[PDB]
Amino acid sequence: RAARKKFPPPSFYMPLLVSSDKAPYRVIPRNLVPIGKGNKDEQIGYWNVQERWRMRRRVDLPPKVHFYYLGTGPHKDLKFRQRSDGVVWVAKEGAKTVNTSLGNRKRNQKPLEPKFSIALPPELSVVEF
Amino acid sequence: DRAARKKFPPPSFYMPLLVSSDKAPYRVIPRNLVPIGKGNKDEQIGYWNVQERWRMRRRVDLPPKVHFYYLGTGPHKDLKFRQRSDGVVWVAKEGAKTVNTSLGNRKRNQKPLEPKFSIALPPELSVVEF
């Protein structure tokens, strides 16, 4: 029972961009978990889709996805693989399907560029900066 | 059903509000700020979901937007009424019941409606038009 904050929690990582066409749930591999936090049983979570559009003179833009460990983030309440549109689940071998201890990024902490053990598929790219 | 999965989170039936000034959305949005015109009396309950907004010009933080969803619908369809989640602001009118509503979500190709209320909007809230 922490104090309530005004905005949903930030990701530890920079987002990926989904360049097309195919659904994020289609293109993000089962085991696309960023490397470098938690123990082996904590390499599990989800990518949350952000739909993106802008006015120039409505232009639909590639969506972004942001990664959160299981039991953290905007969908901290969801059990592993509980169905929610725009939520894409990932886990590596050895993970356990329980809430992790990792919390959320502090707002003034810069996000990290996510690195992986697998190649990114062609439709996924890291958003730099 | 247990409907086929969709690629994006569900859209709101309504246009968003904009939260100007300094205060947190949870502070400014009244307890009973439920848009009018769908559902029965027991369904006038749900939440406003905060969208943080910032762009680059040459990073400019913008006023956040909030989008309304009936209880048991939207990106937080899984949450019980008033289950704590940062950026989720709960609302209900008198007579509502704290159970999932029957209303679902807007179809993507249906245009959002401008939300109308039984109460004045506080000074920090305005409708995003069009």
Side-chain angles (χ1 to χ4, degrees), chain A residues 1-52 54-55 59-105 107-109 111-127, chain B residues 3-56 59-106 108-110 112-130:
Chain A
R1 311 202 59 85
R4 77 195 167 167
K5 297 185 193 284
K6 79 185 236 180
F7 290 138
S11 176
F12 288 105
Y13 303 96
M14 297 175 339
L16 309 177
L17 198 70
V18 189
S19 74
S20 320
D21 171 78
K22 304 128 191 154
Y25 63 76
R26 176 77 73 321
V27 302
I28 293 169
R30 72 184 180 81
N31 52 341
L32 191 78
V33 184
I35 294 162
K37 304 179 55 75
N39 65 32
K40 194 171 204 209
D41 60 33
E42 292 177 310
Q43 308 307 304
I44 183 164
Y46 56 95
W47 292 91
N48 197 41
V49 177
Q50 181 202 336
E51 188 172 356
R52 293 172 64 236
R54 74 160 135 256
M55 290 292 160
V59 182
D60 291 318
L61 299 171
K64 286 175 179 165
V65 291
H66 301 259
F67 173 82
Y68 301 91
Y69 294 100
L70 185 63
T72 80
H75 302 294
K76 73 176 302 264
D77 62 299
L78 294 182
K79 296 178 177 25
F80 188 55
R81 290 171 68 238
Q82 190 166 349
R83 295 166 297 113
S84 187
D85 291 334
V87 179
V88 182
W89 299 94
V90 286
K92 283 186 160 170
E93 184 180 69
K96 294 192 57 200
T97 57
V98 305
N99 288 342
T100 74
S101 73
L102 297 174
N104 306 294
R105 196 197 78 211
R107 289 182 63 68
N108 72 3
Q109 205 172 347
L112 303 157
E113 177 162 285
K115 296 282 178 210
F116 308 102
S117 305
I118 56 170
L120 285 180
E123 301 83 359
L124 296 179
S125 67
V126 177
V127 176
Chain B
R5 75 194 163 168
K6 300 190 192 282
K7 62 187 226 161
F8 292 142
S12 174
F13 287 105
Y14 302 98
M15 288 298 288
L17 308 176
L18 196 71
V19 190
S20 298
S21 203
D22 40 14
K23 302 165 186 178
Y26 65 76
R27 251 246 262 150
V28 300
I29 293 169
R31 72 183 180 85
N32 53 341
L33 190 75
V34 185
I36 296 161
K38 306 182 48 80
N40 67 30
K41 198 167 200 203
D42 61 31
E43 294 176 311
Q44 305 310 297
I45 180 162
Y47 58 95
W48 293 89
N49 199 39
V50 175
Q51 178 200 341
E52 191 173 351
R53 293 174 61 238
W54 60 265
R55 75 209 186 199
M56 296 296 319
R59 176 210 173 88
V60 178
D61 288 324
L62 297 180
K65 284 174 185 173
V66 290
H67 301 259
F68 173 81
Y69 300 90
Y70 294 100
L71 184 64
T73 79
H76 302 294
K77 72 182 290 192
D78 63 293
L79 295 178
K80 304 186 177 183
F81 187 54
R82 292 170 66 237
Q83 191 168 348
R84 293 165 295 113
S85 188
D86 290 332
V88 178
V89 180
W90 298 97
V91 288
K93 286 186 157 169
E94 186 177 73
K97 295 194 354 96
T98 55
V99 304
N100 289 338
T101 74
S102 70
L103 299 175
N105 306 294
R106 195 196 81 207
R108 288 182 64 68
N109 71 12
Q110 20 166 178
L113 304 158
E114 173 164 278
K116 295 276 278 139
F117 306 102
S118 304
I119 56 166
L121 284 177
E124 302 85 355
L125 296 182
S126 65
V127 176
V128 178
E129 212 306 76
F130 99 71

Short mmCIF file of all heavy atoms in Angstrom, two decimals, chain A residues 41-42 44 70-71 80 95-101:
data_model
loop_
_atom_site.label_atom_id
_atom_site.label_comp_id
_atom_site.label_asym_id
_atom_site.label_seq_id
_atom_site.Cartn_x
_atom_site.Cartn_y
_atom_site.Cartn_z
N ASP A 41 14.29 -16.38 -12.25
CA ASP A 41 12.89 -16.61 -12.21
C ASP A 41 12.06 -15.38 -12.54
O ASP A 41 10.85 -15.47 -12.82
CB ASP A 41 12.42 -17.39 -10.99
CG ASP A 41 12.73 -16.75 -9.70
OD1 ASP A 41 12.72 -15.53 -9.67
OD2 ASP A 41 12.96 -17.47 -8.65
N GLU A 42 12.71 -14.22 -12.64
CA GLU A 42 12.01 -12.91 -12.90
C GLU A 42 12.10 -12.49 -14.34
O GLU A 42 11.65 -11.37 -14.65
CB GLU A 42 12.58 -11.85 -11.97
CG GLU A 42 12.26 -12.04 -10.52
CD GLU A 42 12.87 -11.04 -9.58
OE1 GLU A 42 14.12 -10.85 -9.72
OE2 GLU A 42 12.11 -10.52 -8.69
N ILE A 44 10.40 -12.37 -17.07
CA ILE A 44 9.02 -12.58 -17.47
C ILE A 44 8.25 -11.25 -17.35
O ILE A 44 8.46 -10.50 -16.41
CB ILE A 44 8.41 -13.71 -16.60
CG1 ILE A 44 6.99 -14.01 -17.04
CG2 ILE A 44 8.53 -13.43 -15.13
CD1 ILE A 44 6.48 -15.34 -16.51
N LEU A 70 6.53 -8.87 -14.93
CA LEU A 70 5.30 -9.39 -14.36
C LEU A 70 5.06 -8.82 -12.94
O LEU A 70 5.95 -8.79 -12.13
CB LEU A 70 5.36 -10.94 -14.32
CG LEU A 70 4.08 -11.66 -13.85
CD1 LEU A 70 2.94 -11.42 -14.75
CD2 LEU A 70 4.43 -13.15 -13.84
N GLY A 71 3.82 -8.37 -12.73
CA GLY A 71 3.44 -7.75 -11.46
C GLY A 71 3.91 -6.35 -11.24
O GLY A 71 3.81 -5.82 -10.12
N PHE A 80 0.06 -13.83 -15.41
CA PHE A 80 0.76 -14.11 -16.67
C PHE A 80 -0.15 -14.62 -17.69
O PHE A 80 -0.85 -15.66 -17.47
CB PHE A 80 1.92 -15.12 -16.43
CG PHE A 80 2.80 -15.31 -17.61
CD1 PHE A 80 3.44 -14.23 -18.25
CD2 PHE A 80 2.97 -16.55 -18.15
CE1 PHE A 80 4.23 -14.43 -19.34
CE2 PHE A 80 3.80 -16.73 -19.27
CZ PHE A 80 4.36 -15.68 -19.87
N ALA A 95 11.98 -18.83 -16.09
CA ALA A 95 11.17 -17.89 -15.37
C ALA A 95 10.09 -18.60 -14.53
O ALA A 95 9.64 -19.70 -14.94
CB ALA A 95 10.49 -16.94 -16.30
N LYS A 96 9.58 -17.97 -13.52
CA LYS A 96 8.40 -18.46 -12.85
C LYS A 96 7.28 -17.48 -13.00
O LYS A 96 7.45 -16.22 -12.97
CB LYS A 96 8.73 -18.67 -11.42
CG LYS A 96 9.76 -19.78 -11.26
CD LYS A 96 9.86 -20.16 -9.78
CE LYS A 96 8.51 -20.60 -9.17
NZ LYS A 96 8.43 -20.53 -7.67
N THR A 97 6.09 -18.01 -13.08
CA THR A 97 4.86 -17.22 -13.35
C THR A 97 4.30 -16.58 -12.08
O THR A 97 3.19 -16.80 -11.69
CB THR A 97 3.80 -18.06 -14.12
OG1 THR A 97 3.54 -19.22 -13.30
CG2 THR A 97 4.31 -18.53 -15.43
N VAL A 98 5.13 -15.84 -11.37
CA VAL A 98 4.74 -15.10 -10.19
C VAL A 98 5.23 -13.66 -10.31
O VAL A 98 6.24 -13.38 -10.99
CB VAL A 98 5.15 -15.68 -8.88
CG1 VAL A 98 4.68 -17.12 -8.76
CG2 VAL A 98 6.59 -15.63 -8.66
N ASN A 99 4.59 -12.76 -9.60
CA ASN A 99 4.93 -11.36 -9.60
C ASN A 99 6.38 -11.21 -9.22
O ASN A 99 6.89 -11.81 -8.24
CB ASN A 99 4.08 -10.56 -8.66
CG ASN A 99 2.69 -10.42 -9.18
OD1 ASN A 99 2.41 -10.60 -10.33
ND2 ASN A 99 1.79 -10.06 -8.27
N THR A 100 7.09 -10.38 -9.94
CA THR A 100 8.52 -10.12 -9.67
C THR A 100 8.67 -9.04 -8.58
O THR A 100 7.71 -8.38 -8.17
CB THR A 100 9.24 -9.65 -10.93
OG1 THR A 100 8.87 -8.28 -11.24
CG2 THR A 100 9.02 -10.51 -12.13
N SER A 101 9.92 -8.88 -8.16
CA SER A 101 10.27 -7.94 -7.05
C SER A 101 10.75 -6.63 -7.53
O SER A 101 11.23 -5.80 -6.74
CB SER A 101 11.32 -8.65 -6.17
OG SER A 101 12.57 -8.69 -6.84
#
